[PDB]
Amino acid sequence: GKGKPRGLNSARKLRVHRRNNRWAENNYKKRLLGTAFKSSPFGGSSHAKGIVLEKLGIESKQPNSAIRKCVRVQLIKNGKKVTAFVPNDGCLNFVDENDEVLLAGFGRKGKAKGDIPGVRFKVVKVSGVSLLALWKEKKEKPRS
Amino acid sequence: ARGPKKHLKRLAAPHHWLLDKLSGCYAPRPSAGPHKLRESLPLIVFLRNRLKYALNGREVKAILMQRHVKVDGKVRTDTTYPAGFMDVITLDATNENFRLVYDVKGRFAVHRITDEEASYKLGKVKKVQLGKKGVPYVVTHDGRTIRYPDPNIKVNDTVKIDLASGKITDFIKFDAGKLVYVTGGRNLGRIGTIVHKERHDGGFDLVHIKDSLDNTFVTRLNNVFVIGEQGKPYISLPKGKGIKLSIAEERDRRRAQQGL
Amino acid sequence: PRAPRTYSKTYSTPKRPYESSRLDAELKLAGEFGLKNKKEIYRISFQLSKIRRAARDLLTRDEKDPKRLFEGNALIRRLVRVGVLSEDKKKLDYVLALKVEDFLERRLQTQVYKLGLAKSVHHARVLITQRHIAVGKQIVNIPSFMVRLDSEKHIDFAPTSPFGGARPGRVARRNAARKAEASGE
Amino acid sequence: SDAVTIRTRKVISNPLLARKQFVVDVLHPNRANVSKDELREKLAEVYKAEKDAVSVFGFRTQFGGGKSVGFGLVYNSVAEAKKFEPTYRLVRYGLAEKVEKASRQQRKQKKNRDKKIFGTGKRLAKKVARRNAD
Amino acid sequence: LDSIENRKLFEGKNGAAKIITIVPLVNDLDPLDILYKLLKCADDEGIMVQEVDSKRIFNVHIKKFKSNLKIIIPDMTNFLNILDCAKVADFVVFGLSGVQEVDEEFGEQIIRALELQGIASYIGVISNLSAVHEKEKFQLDVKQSLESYFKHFFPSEERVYNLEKNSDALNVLRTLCQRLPRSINWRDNRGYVVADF
Amino acid sequence: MAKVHGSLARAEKPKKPKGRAYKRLLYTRRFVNVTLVNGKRRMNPGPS
RNA sequence: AUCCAAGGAAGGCAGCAGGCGCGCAAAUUACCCAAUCCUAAUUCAGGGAGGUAGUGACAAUAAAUAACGAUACAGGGCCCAUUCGGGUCUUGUAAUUGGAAUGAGUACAAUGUAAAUACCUUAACGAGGAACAAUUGGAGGGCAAGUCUGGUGCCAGCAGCCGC
């Protein structure tokens, strides 16, 4: 009878079977082990601030050849070194080194076929300033 | 809590006070006295919320500090004095009298009383016992302790008390086929005749009551109060006569009292 | 620490955002009735949804039940009072064939145009919001007033408004003052 | 065109506060919000009482105007009005005086400076005046 | 521990050099007006009297917050002097007149030039909001206009404070006495001296 | 770019109307002015 | 961890405001006991409990940014077309013209309130609105929207997914 017990005094076997088989999910296992509270670089938050250590010319080769513009940051809350993408600025003229940056998440899945990376994070603010309004020229950036 | 409380928040009020939930932030916590906290009615609510005589809180204080309001013959000066069931409220300068009787919906209602009816007061005997130097006494539903009763008075008997002297005038013993008002619980405010007494020793007793329209309901023994006989109540009953109506009957009555 | 004051939402976001037949039907409704938002349609959809849920969960109960007859008569009578449900259709079955246009026709928005007090539906909303229209004696300037049936023989102009009463407005007497000064000049 | 009409709803005689309490309706076509003073005069002359024994408050005009609703008291004498009314409404009526006070921060700091003084303080005043003179 | 150890340059009792450069951006605004409306809410008016006669560089100890401020007012014609005064500051105060606009050829060029050469922590300051009509119902409109204008060039602040009131001026004084400024990278890599004798 | 100090609101081709007039305009542009291009209601066509 | 004449002496804001630190992340060192209640020897005194206002795009409700005409011009349709022209509509435009309506805002006053601010009323001003100027994201497919022009094509076939 469908390989599972159907007796009317068998609720215990059913719920122990569910608690054993829910560890095969992905979100459950990340969620009840405290994965984000231990090893994820944001520590389970939606944003983070950090200090720019480097500007990086990452390369995406195949099948799209592009020069990815990234930034190696050291986060303030953790002491954690994270590279992150910065959009829409070909010059990175709003970014210098040793500036403070508000980062968010970024869902690009890079490919394995040509060693192209998808870094996990985008730049939202530099030096307190909205990077969008910089690139759309609605504010000016204080340069320290 | 590190000691006894002194406040009562406005959501934690008994719902049968009909207090609005956005007037202020609290409700008047009733004092210690003749009635239970949960089922009392303090004087501030009866002056302001139901008789509309006082607009503010301090107008209640101004009226009560002029000794107009008597609760069961005596003048009270407390804002939150627990006036409860079967009690007599007397306004001399207004020349009005009120008996606190539950409505059919389970809340206290305004109820005008003649001077002859205002002289007495009923009370359910809650314990009879033999106190010091061997004197018997009864203790009623409001806390009144009366020495030297009739020996036929047992527990649950309703006793008539004349408010002038505070003596036992006469009484009714708890017999089947008597007129009974209901004090607590879901069926609160109904007037009926008890069919019989169901008895569970070691636990809670139960009472089957049958109303004027032959509906039958069941309460515990705690929620029972005896008034009188069939068609002979010792007090004057409010309008509606403790008769529980269905919602359709009430709706039809409301639109039948609308004929321009 | 008080009573946490209650509130609710009133519109409902549709499930799929781009759906050509739905966009066309909504815009036909807006054109026939002079709306401004899709939210003004979603409000009527949400109210009709709650009414249909009340209906179809009272239908599962058997008849001659006091809850069904009670709440059904309350619902049906309340719909008849606003003229959304007609006189013959006073059953629970006909409130489920009751559609959005039946609600949307009963607006003050619509009833000003339909009584011949405005030239356009857009002109009807304009005369509403510029405080020109009274129901009995009280002036209403919300187009979503949802005229109850008995209130139909009271919609007119206001005694405040120049169309219905007292002195002509700002531009009118301004131009009259310029005419009188220029005739004096 | 106008004629200010005054109606009294919900008329209650309260002998416990020695007064009469009611609802003031004012029909005022072509008028804005017929003031408290005129209502005190006209209720004093309808109910045949002193103006100082007549109070009105809590007014609000309906949407669109032309009608206002408030609350109205009329006492049995002027002295009963004096002894039962709140003091702010007496100051509104000119029947008393605004009691000029210090600010509340001032009096709290005054009280807390007084709390550090046990006794009259003139003993301590003499001793500190002597030691400053020392 | 590290956050307290990074305040050892700023005990204003001995080696503290909290340099504030006060730049009015409109010539109908006096810099000593701003300085006096600041130091009057410190309630030590001897400093206000001793700052009058002929000085540009002030070495002030405030015993309230126990801080060592160093006030510089730039020459308001030599634009090079304005640049040189702001590139040594730890704090930059921006005066905004409530009546005359910031000049597109003079004031805006100060803002953009100091900003593009790099500013540390700054404060926006109004001193003539009561030179507008005395009702605050119209003064708040001018204050919000100046705030929205200053938001364009500087989004790190949203309160452009009024020196007419004790509240906002004491707030600005607290800021200048306590708060640690953001560091300008190029100058802190090479070391810098301000020097009296 | 940067708006001037005078933000005190108190004391070219024509614009598109806002809100409900814009919905009125769209109702004219889709259902009063029927534009059948090659058997279809074509919106935003180029030179054709 | 505070003062100090060095002997000694004081300390607990996870109460209301407010500061530092921390961080993606969070308000005024305002007014008042008039409400609602509470405490006391008590009607009166007291209450950062609480109420009021500021700040506040946390959410939530309602809904301004325009509405009518006449002209022409281009059409379309309705019937009379023998042809003209006889009216009924409905469009489109023409930064063409006309007379209207009204609040945003300002404000005598009055209401409001403990005192105010604001709201509801209301004298007197207040628009052709070529600027009392509606934005935010898109226009390969998913998924509504380009068969358009220029530059790019050495920072560029490109980037939730597929990608050309």
Task: Throw out a few tags for this protein.
part of a larger assembly; 6 chains; A: 144 residues; alpha+beta; 6-stranded antiparallel β-sheet; 6 strands; 15% helix; B: 260 residues; mainly beta; Structural Genomics Hypothetical 15.5 Kd Protein In mrcA-pckA Intergenic Region, Chain A; OB fold (Dihydrolipoamide Acetyltransferase, E2P); SH3 type barrels; 3 domains; 5-stranded antiparallel β-sheet; 3 helices; 16 strands; globular; RNA-binding; ribosomal protein (chain D); isopeptide bond (chain D); Ribosomal_eS24 (chain D)
Question: Layout of helices and strands, plus pairs?
Answer:
This is part of a larger assembly, with chains A (144 residues), B (260 residues), C (185 residues), D (134 residues), E (197 residues) and F (48 residues).
Chain C: H1 20-33, H2 39-58, H3 66-81, H4 100-104, H5 108-114, H6 121-129, E1 133-135, E2 138-139, E3 155-157, H7 170-184
Antiparallel strand pairs in C: 1-2, 1-3
Helix pairs in contact in C: 5-6
Chain D: E1 5-14, E2 19-27, H1 36-46, E3 54-61, E4 67-75, H2 78-84, H3 87-92, H4 104-114, H5 122-133
Antiparallel strand pairs in D: 1-2, 2-4, 3-4
Chain F: H1 20-32, E1 36-37, E2 40-41
Antiparallel strand pairs in F: 1-2
Chain C binds one RNA strand of 164 nucleotides through α6 and α7.
What does this structure look like?
The structure is cut from a larger assembly and holds chains A (144 residues), B (260 residues), C (185 residues), D (134 residues), E (197 residues) and F (48 residues). Helix content of chain A is 15%, strand content 30%. Chain A has helices at 11-21, 27-32, 131-135; strands at residues 47-60, 66-75, 81-85, 100-105, 121-126, 129-130. Chain A starts with 10 loop residues before the first helix and ends in a 9-residue tail after the last helix. Chain A has a 6-stranded antiparallel beta sheet. Chain A has one domain (1-144). The longest helix of chain A has 11 residues, at 11-21. Chain C is 46% helix and 4% strand. In chain C, strands 2-1-3 form a 3-stranded antiparallel beta sheet, with no helix packed on it. Chain C has one domain (17-185). In chain E, strand 5 (121-126), helix 6 and strand 6 form a beta-alpha-beta unit. The longest helix of chain E has 18 residues, at 136-153. Chain E is globular and about 45 Å long. The B-C interface holds B 9-11, 21-22, 25, 246-248, 251 and C 1-3, 5, 66, 69-70. Chain C binds one RNA strand of 164 nucleotides through helix 6 and helix 7. Chain C: It comes from Saccharomyces cerevisiae (strain ATCC 204508 / S288c) (Baker's yeast). Chain C: Residues 159-185 are annotated as: Disordered.
